[PDB]
Predict the structure of Peptidoglycan D,D-transpeptidase FtsI.
Amino acid sequence: QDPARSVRHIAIPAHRGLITDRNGEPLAVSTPVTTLWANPKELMTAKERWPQLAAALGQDTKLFADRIEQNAEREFIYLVRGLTPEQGEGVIALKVPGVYSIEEFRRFYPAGEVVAHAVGFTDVDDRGREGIELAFDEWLAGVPGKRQVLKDRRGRVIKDVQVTKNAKPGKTLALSIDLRLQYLAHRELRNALLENGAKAGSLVIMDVKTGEILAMTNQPTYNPNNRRNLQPAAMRNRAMIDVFEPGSTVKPFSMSAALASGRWKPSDIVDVYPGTLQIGRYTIRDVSRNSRQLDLTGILIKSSNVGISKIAFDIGAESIYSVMQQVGLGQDTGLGFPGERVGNLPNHRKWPKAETATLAYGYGLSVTAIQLAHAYAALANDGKSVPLSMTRVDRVPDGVQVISPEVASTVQGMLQQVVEAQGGVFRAQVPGYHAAGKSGTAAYRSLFAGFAPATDPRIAMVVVIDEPSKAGYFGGLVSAPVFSKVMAGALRLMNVPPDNLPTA
């Protein structure tokens, strides 16, 4: 016979660590629940109790009975996982022979859909599946304990023996996300999609000095507390997973290389007439073709592919590739989110003219919205690229000085003109502040990337609107007004003073 007594092991689930926003607002909270297990050998002695037990478990009478009967020779099965503690005590109070309980936890997400992708969610086993819950799973999960119970020959629990290993609680995590800014970004991106009839979109806000991600929202979104019917489209963390060719939004990096070469200054003029440039078989074409001479700021205002290409041929692709690589376009962010996409930054030993030109005006490389925002953050932070963080930064790390402060300041002023000057991106203007930025077109994505205050930058932001299909309230670039609204609120939520003084 089997021994009259045996010492069996039961895991002790650990309490998963609290996730908060940067201000301590709870974002993911472990909630006590009760799991019930049973010894079928004992249940088989108390069959008249089964229907009441099945009812208390929310299970069908006959499906429940079938399950016990088919497991009659086992000494352990789960009856139900994750009942409320109240529902649990109700089941336990039936006093059915062979019914036992385990204290576990399940997550609740107080901000729900507002921060769905960034926070992510746990699986049925309380394990991180998406977002920060996934990226920091080991930190948040801790380590289960193990305890021993004395059982008899038929698996009846006689008593607790001891705990052999205590559970190590999961550890707390404060995100860089500011829920105040995340709500503003979530609301405005949702409104922009509705008014533009768009498929999807993303918005990222970064602190340019600290590398912190202050907001990251995508549409569609979902309620992580109720995923019954959640469609895969909604679950996608587009800001980190969708790659696209950034188009004219990378011209400022080409310009930074031009100004660093020693060969170009902002007042220089390039003749871009007639809005095309033939290089062998290939023709470089501007979208708008109403220009002849443009200064360097003009090339940006007009999104002149021709103009930036002539500059690129003069300075060489290598110098542009170097800046783009160093600011992180097509490069690992270091954020450690499994499944994050890196995109691609093409390299060559001998750069063909077509590849040089297209790199310079943003085709042939592919990036994510996070990378684009980090790149603009370096430009905004006087050329210093601080590593990205999704967690609160108290001690600011050194950044790599990727662009000289002087070149960065010059480009900031050019991008301020892109927003402010006649012919520029009118609806990107941020009332009460000077803002700086650049539009582009990634079945298209509308892109806007920028920062503010333009003369002393604090915040960088990228807006991506995927496949707009309906006319919005304002004309012009679809993503521009979203930048305007979100930047206006974010700057004020952060108490950033206006930089548009009357000449002081």
